[PDB]
Amino acid sequence: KKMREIIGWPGGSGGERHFVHQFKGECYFTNGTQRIRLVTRYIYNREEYLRFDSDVGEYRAVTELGRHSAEYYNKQYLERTRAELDTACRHNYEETEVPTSLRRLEQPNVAISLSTLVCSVTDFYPAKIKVRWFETVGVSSTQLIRNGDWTFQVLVMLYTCHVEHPSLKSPITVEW
Amino acid sequence: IEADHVGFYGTTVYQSPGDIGQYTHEFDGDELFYVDLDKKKTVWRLPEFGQLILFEPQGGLQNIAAEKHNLGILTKRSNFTPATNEAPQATVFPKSPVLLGQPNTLICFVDNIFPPVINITWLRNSKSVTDGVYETSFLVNRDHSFHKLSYLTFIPSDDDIYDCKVEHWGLEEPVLKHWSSA
Ligand SMILES: *[C@@H]1O[C@H](CO)[C@@H](O)[C@H](O)[C@H]1NC(C)=O
Numbered sequence: 001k002k003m004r005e006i007i008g009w010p011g012g013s014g015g016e017r018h019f020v021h022q023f024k025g026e027c028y029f030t031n032g033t034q035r036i037r038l039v040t041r042y043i044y045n046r047e048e049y050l051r052f053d054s055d056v057g058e059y060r061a062v063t064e065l066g067r068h069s070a071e072y073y074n075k076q077y078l079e080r081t082r083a084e085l086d087t088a089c090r091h092n093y094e095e096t097e098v099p100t101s102l103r104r105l106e107q108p109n110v111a112i113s114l115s116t117l118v119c120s121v122t123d124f125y126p127a128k129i130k131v132r133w134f135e136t137v138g139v140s141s142t143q144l145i146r147n148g149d150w151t152f153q154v155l156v157m158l159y160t161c162h163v164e165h166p167s168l169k170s171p172i173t174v175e176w
Numbered sequence: 177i178e179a180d181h182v183g184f185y186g187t188t189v190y191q192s193p194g195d196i197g198q199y200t201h202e203f204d205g206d207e208l209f210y211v212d213l214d215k216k217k218t219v220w221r222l223p224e225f226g227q228l229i230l231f232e233p234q235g236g237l238q239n240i241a242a243e244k245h246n247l248g249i250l251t252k253r254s255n256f257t258p259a260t261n262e263a264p265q266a267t268v269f270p271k272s273p274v275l276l277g278q279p280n281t282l283i284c285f286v287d288n289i290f291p292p293v294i295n296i297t298w299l300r301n302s303k304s305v306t307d308g309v310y311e312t313s314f315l316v317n318r319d320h321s322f323h324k325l326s327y328l329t330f331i332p333s334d335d336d337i338y339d340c341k342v343e344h345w346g347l348e349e350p351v352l353k354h355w356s357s358a
Pocket residue numbers: 064065253254255
């Protein structure tokens with residue numbers, strides 16, 4: 001039960017205000033862990049200057065600011081970094097991301113109301129969901145809304161409201 | 177860039193002055209946990225996860241050390257190029273369908289935050305509201321900017337006017353997203 005971190009490595013140098021630096025480790029999964037991709041970003045302020053990439057297989061300068069940086073990180077961290085696709089990505093997914101995120105199921109609360117009727121689907125997880133009215137036109141839904149507490153919500157405007165979400169055994173309906 | 181699921185690990189953000197650091201993890205957008213740097217402690221967004229899995233806070237404290245280091249380096253290399261102050265975009269909306277008298281959460285979504293230094297405060301009828309207020313970490317964007325969410329626990333009533341006040345260096349005047357049951 002151990003989630004691991006993607007190491008942001010220290011760089012070298014040579015050659016009063018407010019300044020920012022960011023490091024981003026990113027894993028892109030498909031078919032579970034069939035296809036796994038590891039992108040790494042080093043960012044002064046909002047400028048990504050250096051980047052690792054599974055598909056590339058090595059560090060590459062993104063801007064002039066990371067010009068001599070690519071060489072350095074290769075000479076140094078290319079070893080341990082390329083291996084992080086399994087020590088961090090493939091690991092976290094199969095070991096810590098399944099018993100938690102991928103296992104999280106949250107049932108949606110449905111409720112219709114007259115503002116044009118608004119079908120309110122809320123507090124559901126994951127995001128994958130399909131909703132229909134009982135018609136094709138006169139329909140208009142808001143973009144999927146991330147609440148930021150691991151629950152979503154969406155409001156479809158326009159009588160039964162059919163909702164098919166993974167967290168449910170049988171698609172629930174609400175009449176007006 | 178397409179996929180099935182996207183986990184952000186080792187996501188670090190240091191900045192100065194003030195030695196302001198932040199380390200977090202995410203999964204398909206939602207924050208797993210941040211690391212309290214002052215108290216060297218992992219703080220999971222969802223406690224259930226903190227009882228199932230563990231993240232050694234040190235592994236995060238190192239990226240901070242690394243990022244603190246990288247900051248001074250790139251700062252000089254960039255020729256002391258200060259960060260530019262972008263204007264945030266606030267949005268207020270209830271967590272669940274509004275019902276008079278029944279407990280709810282009012283959400284203030286803020287986007288385009290940079291640098292990661294902000295003051296999202298709540299107002300009930302032009303009155304500062306301190307208690308029942310909760311924030312997320314600074315969540316990363318592809319912009320390499322940040323978005324943040326504030327939560328206000330409240331009782332929906334028609335005779336209450338709410339405002340989300342945002343104070344940032346990129347603003348000569350604070351944002352004031354108005355919201356009310358009406
Ligand atoms: C910083 O200053 C040097 C000397 O004028 C200049 O050549 C260089 O382009 C600057 N650095 C960057 C990458 O902005």
